[PDB]
Amino acid sequence: MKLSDIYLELKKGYADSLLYSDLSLLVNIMEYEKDIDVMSIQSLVAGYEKSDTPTITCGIIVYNESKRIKKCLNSVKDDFNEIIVLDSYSTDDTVDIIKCDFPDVEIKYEKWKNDFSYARNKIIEYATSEWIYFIDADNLYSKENKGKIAKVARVLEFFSIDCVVSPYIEEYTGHLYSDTRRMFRLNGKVKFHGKVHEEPMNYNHSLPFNFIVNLKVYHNENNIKSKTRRNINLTEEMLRLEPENPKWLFFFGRELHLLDKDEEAIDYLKKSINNYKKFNDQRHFIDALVLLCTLLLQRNNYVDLTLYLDILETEYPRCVDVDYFRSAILLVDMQNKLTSLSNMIDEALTDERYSAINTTKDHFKRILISLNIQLENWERVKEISGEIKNDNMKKEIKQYLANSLHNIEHVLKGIE
Amino acid sequence: MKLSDIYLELKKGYADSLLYSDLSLLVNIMEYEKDIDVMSIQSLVAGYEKSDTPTITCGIIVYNESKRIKKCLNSVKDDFNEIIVLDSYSTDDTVDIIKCDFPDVEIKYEKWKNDFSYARNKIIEYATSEWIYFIDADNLYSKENKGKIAKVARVLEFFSIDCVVSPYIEEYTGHLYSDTRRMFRLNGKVKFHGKVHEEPMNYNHSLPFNFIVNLKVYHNSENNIKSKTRRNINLTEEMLRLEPENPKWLFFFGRELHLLDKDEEAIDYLKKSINNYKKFNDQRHFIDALVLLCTLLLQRNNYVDLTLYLDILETEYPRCVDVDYFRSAILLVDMQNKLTSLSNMIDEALTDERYSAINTTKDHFKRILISLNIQLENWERVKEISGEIKNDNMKKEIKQYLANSLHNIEHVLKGIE
Ligand SMILES: O=c1ccn([C@@H]2O[C@H](COP(=O)(O)OP(=O)(O)O[C@H]3O[C@H](CO)[C@@H](O)[C@H](O)[C@H]3O)[C@@H](O)[C@H]2O)c(=O)[nH]1
Ligand SMILES: O=c1ccn([C@@H]2O[C@H](COP(=O)(O)OP(=O)(O)O[C@H]3O[C@H](CO)[C@@H](O)[C@H](O)[C@H]3O)[C@@H](O)[C@H]2O)c(=O)[nH]1
What we know:
Chain A: Its EC number is 2.4.1.-. The structure is a homodimer. By secondary structure, chain A is an alpha/beta fold. The first copy, chain A, folds into four domains: 3-49, no CATH class; 56-219, Spore Coat Polysaccharide Biosynthesis Protein SpsA, Chain A, CATH 3.90.550; 224-319, Serine Threonine Protein Phosphatase 5, Tetratricopeptide repeat, CATH 1.25.40; 338-411, no CATH class. Chain A contains 16 helices and eleven strands. A five-stranded mixed β-sheet of chain A has the order 3-2-1-4-8, with helices on both faces. The first copy, chain A, has a four-stranded mixed β-sheet with strand order 5-11-6-7. In chain A, helix 8 (224-241) packs antiparallel against helix 9 (246-258). Chains A and B meet through helix 11, helix 13, helix 14, helix 15 and helix 16 of A and helix 11, helix 13, helix 14, helix 15 and helix 16 of B. The complex binds uridine-5'-diphosphate-glucose (2 copies). The site of one uridine-5'-diphosphate-glucose has 16 residues of chain B, from strand 1, helix 6 and helix 8.
């Protein structure tokens, strides 16, 4: 059997049950290709209510998080049995904000070596439970996960599936990450690797299966500039060890972008993309393509965007962002068609050629306003709008300029 | 020696001369086909110095014209010497605004028969000068037409040219008419024909040649237009029922139907007029028929039939810039269409079972939509869509972009006029 099959058989067969109820916190089930050996589907829902419920501990590593450690721990101090904060010798409060308001949370210490894995890996060895789940301090643990976490541990042990576990992280942007690898069995197998952009690897160097489970965490400045300068130092390091690695070329390339060094980021993204072709962990391959495409787009480099676009479209055909960059290009072509039309109208007006409608060629000025407003070309519309030579056209334009003046401050009203 | 060549031997040479000054008040000159008997050039400039300067009477027919008759007669009184004013028994004052300030302008009377040419007769009779000039109550004789009139009458009497004379008459819309036919020699050769849309004709009903001269005459309107039209159409329909296949009248009746908001029917007459001008001799208003049918076809969003009448407009009057106006409007409508079809092709897209790697919220798609419908001025949907974006920084920039164009509108709106 495949876990996929087991879930189906449990749908019409045993949707009554608890094994079912708790197996539906697993999003990711049709991805699990390993045989789960079973000899009776009936004995299984029955043996699941007899199953042990495991212990989860919650590891947080903090530096100067005076601003956000309170809301963080509040989200989380009721959902675990043991919470371990790992102070890297904060210069501000943090430590004592924790000590009075949160009496039950262990506080430990560790000087910062420039290694998120070493820190993270301390809390692993300090931790007493039999699963761990990591959460960072600017993050917040949805009210919705109440009583759900250990249910996820329980099923995965009940089938004894080896995996790390990703909840959904929702960016403050609303962007929703699902390769987060934040929870895993505390059983000697599996330890963080990497000075930065670290993730749990099962220690034969690995790459464990990832259950996306149905748990959620939410956000809680222009200190992005701060954090990024910190990480690029670490990323460039990790990359100099493996200078041809597509993941590291992309990671570095990305942070270069974040430090607006876009021309240099495009080079690393172009190299990352060449190297993913024949390379096994293709997880961030898409992230390189859609970033190189936006940067190429932002530099009005349509030929190279089209080339990379065809790659994104053949390598990931069900990615909607292909349709995004194609739209963006048509809309560019339309701008030029508008401009070219604005330009033959000017060429027309400057002949000897007479008008039978309005000898003042003043109806042409209706189209040219219309057409340069559309092009956002207020420079040239303000102009054209003086060259008008008649009251009742002027009378016509100002009354139409107002009804859109007031349609704007109507939509501008009800956003913020 | 033709006339346009006499003007080349003055412009090149005899160029400070009094003949050349008065002859540059004639615009229409290379059109004058008749040849002229000269001695030399010299003989001809000096004969002009010893020539004359004829007299011009100014004719005005009027009905209830209380509001404009004062401004009118001002423009004219210091410029003609004799001006007759034919009242048609106007029920309001009018006649006595003329009494007061304009004592030397000889108010004659006449009962109104529905015949504009006939009213123009009765002023040709009473007139005593050599040339006549006509003007209407809603026009103002331009300030800068100072003593230019009789220089026109001189040059035309000197070469003893037969013709009618057209000043430029300015619409309330700023448009300049130059087939106006307002001045002619009072030598029993020229006279108005036609109950309405009268013009001066030779006595064999032929068509006097039209010098366009360099005189400006302006305007003074709101909704007297609907009542003037409703009167004129009564006459026009009569004249039409006489030659019911005459394109000039098919056009005139269609035009007035239009001015009375009977557009659906105005097009039917414009179409027949355009069909009949093909052959027909006097094609003066052929162009006016086409461009009015085109502008109405545009208003009704009938682009298929617009294109077809635009072709005819283009083959017949290729140098009319109004061709390009209509081709432009079409091209631009096709743009709008491509845009809205993209708006929808984008919409279909961000529903499918299809994910984004850039932003799960697809909020970047929604920004492209917002930007289409701002361009499409579909402010309706700019509102819906901007409610469903969850990234506060984009919602901030939509706020700041709208403010940009809000400010720039309120800026261009200021310095119009
Ligand atoms: O010297 C430090 C710096 C940070 N932290 C804490 O550890 C986490 C690091 O997160 P952060 O300061 O937010 O850096 P980011 O770049 O925003 O975090 C991303 O990048 C890190 C570096 O790989 C990852 O560990 C995180 O999972 C990932 O959210 C946070 O809880 C910090 O408070 C420390 O304990 N010591
Ligand atoms: O029973 C009338 C009605 C009007 N008028 C006067 O005649 C002139 C006609 O001008 P208007 O009343 O403004 O009519 P429109 O339709 O605006 O004028 C156009 O249409 C008329 C009919 O063809 C022409 O006389 C004009 O030259 C032409 O400008 C004006 O001075 C009127 O005051 C009369 O004499 N008798």
